[PDB]
Amino acid sequence: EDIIRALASPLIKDGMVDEDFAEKVIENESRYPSGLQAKGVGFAIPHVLGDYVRDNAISVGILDKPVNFSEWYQSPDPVPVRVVFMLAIRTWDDITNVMNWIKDVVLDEEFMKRLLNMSDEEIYRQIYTRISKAPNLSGINFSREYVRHLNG
Amino acid sequence: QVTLKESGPGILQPSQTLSLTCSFSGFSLSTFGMGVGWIRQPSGKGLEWLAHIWWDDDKFYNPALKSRLTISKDTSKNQVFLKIANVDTADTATYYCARIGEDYFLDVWGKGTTVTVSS
Amino acid sequence: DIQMTQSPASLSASVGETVTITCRASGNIHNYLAWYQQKQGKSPQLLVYNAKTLADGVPSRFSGSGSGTQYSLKINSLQPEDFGSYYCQHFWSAPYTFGGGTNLEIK
């Protein structure tokens, strides 16, 4: 359970996803790896796009130390991921819009250096701003409950 | 000019609910990144966190006290309210309303209501 | 919840002397710590925020530094008005609790 329960709990509790979301995500992660290496740190994006997603939401975790898992581009080389974006997204167009948005986030190195050291309240405010500032992603549910530091 | 003023009861009897109202001023409480909260200081003691309201209506409480209290917002006429149930003599203290700024900023630190509890 | 422990409980210094106050966290609080000071009969004022810089209106005679779990405040040329009760407030993760503070008095 790399990040899967820690960041899925609020999606289940607030009704964004079905209760067995975490298991479906794990199996799809095995088939479709989530790790991705940026010039800085790894940024991972777990997702499924099934019909068990009730509403669209982004759960973001920051890790104390990197977690080593396979790359999105089909490579066994583990990626030392520090930030994980679990995407509770219902369909294709919405997830591509989010991934395009995440790329803009990934490429903002100054943001990431800060992000690794941001408090939950600060993380919420800067991500919240980026989601709503963007012309895209209207309709995604993002709140303080979806911002978490992952112990170890 | 941002400033916080307060009003509440003088003497409360043990087990009664304590109602403290803070008059908020100088900016909107709805302003992004801002909030207000309460800090308690029993005479002769240091400071304790008591309660917190965010611009987005999120709420925090000190877990040691939490089961007895709720905090609420009403932006109509700038009101901040704190309500603590089952207050004991142990809760005699100065209760301060502080302004919170974006990325954490306790500054206004309004004068404290003095609350005492006795028979 | 991460707690702050202050040390020493009390300080004794002459006017014009330099003193330091140390606070350490029960966990890593990165850069979000604030230092406050209380005069008798008044609410405390903000001295230092984001664990390092001075608030507007705050004298240049003092500052602070640190990282991770431990920070300190250093005040040079203490003036009579600088003698009072000091507090460390934790901001990494809410509730925004305080250590118990320290008490600085004139020799």
Added chain:
Amino acid sequence: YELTQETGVSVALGRTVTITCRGDSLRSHYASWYQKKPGQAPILLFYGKNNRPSGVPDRFSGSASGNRASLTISGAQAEDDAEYYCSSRDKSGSRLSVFGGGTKLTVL
């Protein structure tokens, strides 16, 4: 007619030729490539920036840049004599799909 494709090519046996596709949607999107024989269902040979499907010869692959996409046919054999197709989005950012005209590749 969103995707422009050539009528056909004469290919010497065992030689390398390139089948191109042009259009505006190709500046932001990749083209998927297909091989078809008369009387048969078409088969996908290449898609994305670099992805050869399983179940096909590993003889060749495509690529894309600019406003053009292409499939390289290499070591072409008699069994590669086929209609070839390319497909992508109609317009950049749109959700509708298009195919080009179809090119006939014949192997000598």
Added chain:
Amino acid sequence: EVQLVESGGGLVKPGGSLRLSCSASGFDFDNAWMTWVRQPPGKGLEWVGRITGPGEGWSVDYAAPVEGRFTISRLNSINFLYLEMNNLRMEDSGLYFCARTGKYYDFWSGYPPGEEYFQDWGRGTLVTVS
């Protein structure tokens, strides 16, 4: 690995209608994306449309030239899809293929809404007019 088989093609008088059918096997038909493509003799492949999955809500996208004359729906309980055509014209004649599609996106170099590929094609069913 999978099968997809079309049927229901036949001769329609201009202005008439018909419904085509296609069965499927060997895969998850609930989260599948299915499309139709047609090839009039002497022509290339014309995309007709796509039916999406339950995650989106079963929306259907059509090529503009066929919009309003075509409808696509499916029954997942029998792995089968259907499409109805109305007000047919000579340009509607051709071999109608059903195909299973996939999705492609490159996080670093792509652009939303990604791209598509038609991974598995059936034989097709022939529709003629007049």
